[PDB]
Amino acid sequence: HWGYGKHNGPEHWHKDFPIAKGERQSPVDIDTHTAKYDPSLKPLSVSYDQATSLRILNNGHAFNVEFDDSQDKAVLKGGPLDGTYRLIQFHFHWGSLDGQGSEHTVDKKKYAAELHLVHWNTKYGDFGKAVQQPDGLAVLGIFLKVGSAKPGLQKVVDVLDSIKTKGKSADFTNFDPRGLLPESLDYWTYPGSLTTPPLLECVTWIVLKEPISVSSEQVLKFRKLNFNGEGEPEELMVDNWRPAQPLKNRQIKASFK
Numbered sequence: 001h002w003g004y005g006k007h008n009g010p011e012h013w014h015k016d017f018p019i020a021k022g023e024r025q026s027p028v029d030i031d032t033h034t035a036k037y038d039p040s041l042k043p044l045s046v047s048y049d050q051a052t053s054l055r056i057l058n059n060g061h062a063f064n065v066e067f068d069d070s071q072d073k074a075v076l077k078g079g080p081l082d083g084t085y086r087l088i089q090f091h092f093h094w095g096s097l098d099g100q101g102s103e104h105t106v107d108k109k110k111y112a113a114e115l116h117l118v119h120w121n122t123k124y125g126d127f128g129k130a131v132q133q134p135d136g137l138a139v140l141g142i143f144l145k146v147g148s149a150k151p152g153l154q155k156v157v158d159v160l161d162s163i164k165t166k167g168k169s170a171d172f173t174n175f176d177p178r179g180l181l182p183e184s185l186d187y188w189t190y191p192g193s194l195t196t197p198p199l200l201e202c203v204t205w206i207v208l209k210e211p212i213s214v215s216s217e218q219v220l221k222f223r224k225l226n227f228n229g230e231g232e233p234e235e236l237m238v239d240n241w242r243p244a245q246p247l248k249n250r251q252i253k254a255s256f257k
C-alpha cells in the first residue's frame with residue numbers, strides 16, 4: 001500500500017522494505033565537484049531504431065510506457081555497461097511545482113521532472129531474474145526543465161486523459177523514445193537501486209548531463225493524473241519522487257571533463 005503520501009511515502013518504506021537504508025540506494029545528489037571524470041568510459045549506445053511501444057499504463061504511482069522486450073529491439077550498450085540491456089518501459093517522476101519533481105539532483109538543484117528509461121540485462125533471461133542481480137538493470141535518467149515544448153513528448157501528453165486513474169491502460173504503439181533524448185549523451189554513472197519499492201539494489205544508473213525542456217502546459221497534464229482508482233476520492237498524482245539518499249561508499253563517474 002506504499003505511495004508518496006504522508007503515511008506511506010518514502011519515509012515509511014523501510015518498515016516494509018528495510019533495504020531503504022541500504023548501501024547503494026537511489027536517487028542521490030550528483031555533486032559535480034566530486035564526480036570524478038572517467039576517460040576510460042565508452043560512449044553510450046542507444047539503439048532505439050527498432051523500439052516497439054505497446055501500452056501506456058497508470059499504475060497508481062506514475063504512468064509507464066511499456067515496450068516489447070521479447071527480443072533485442074531497443075537496447076542500451078556502451079558507457080559503463082558490459083553486455084546488452086533491453087528497454088522494457090519508461091516513466092516520469094514529477095512534482096506539484098516546477099522547483100521540484102526530479103529524483104536525482106545536480107548540486108542540490110531539483111528539476112521539474114525526471115525521465116527514467118529502464119533496461120534489464122539480457123544475460124539474466126527476463127526482468128524478474130535481472131532485478132535480483134547487482135548489474136541487472138540500467139536506468140537512463142533524463143532531467144526535465146520547464147521551457148520550450150518537447151515535440152517528442154506530445155504524443156505521451158495527449159494520451160494521459162485516457163489513463164487518468166489507477167489501473168487504466170491505453171494502447172500506445174509506434175512511439176519513438178528517441179525524441180525524448182537530449183542532444184548530448186554526456187552522463188554521470190553510479191551503482192544504484194530502484195527509486196521505488198522493493199528498492200532492489202540492482203541498477204547501474206546513467207544520468208545524462210543535458211536536460212530536456214518541456215512546456216509548462218505539458219508538465220501540467222502530468223499533474224492532472226490521479227493516484228486513486230476510478231470512483232475513489234480524487235488525489236492528484238503529483239510529487240511522486242523519492243528524495244536523495246546518502247551516497248555512502250559510492251563514486252559517481254562522469255563521461256565528460
Ligand SMILES: CC(=O)Nc1nnc(S(N)(=O)=O)s1
Nearest residue numbers: 089116118139193194195196
Ligand atoms: C517496472 C520496473 O522497471 N520497475 C521500476 N521500479 N522503479 C523503477 S525506477 N524509478 O528506479 O526507474 S523502474
Ligand SMILES: [Zn+2]
Nearest residue numbers: 091093116195
Ligand atoms: Zn523512475
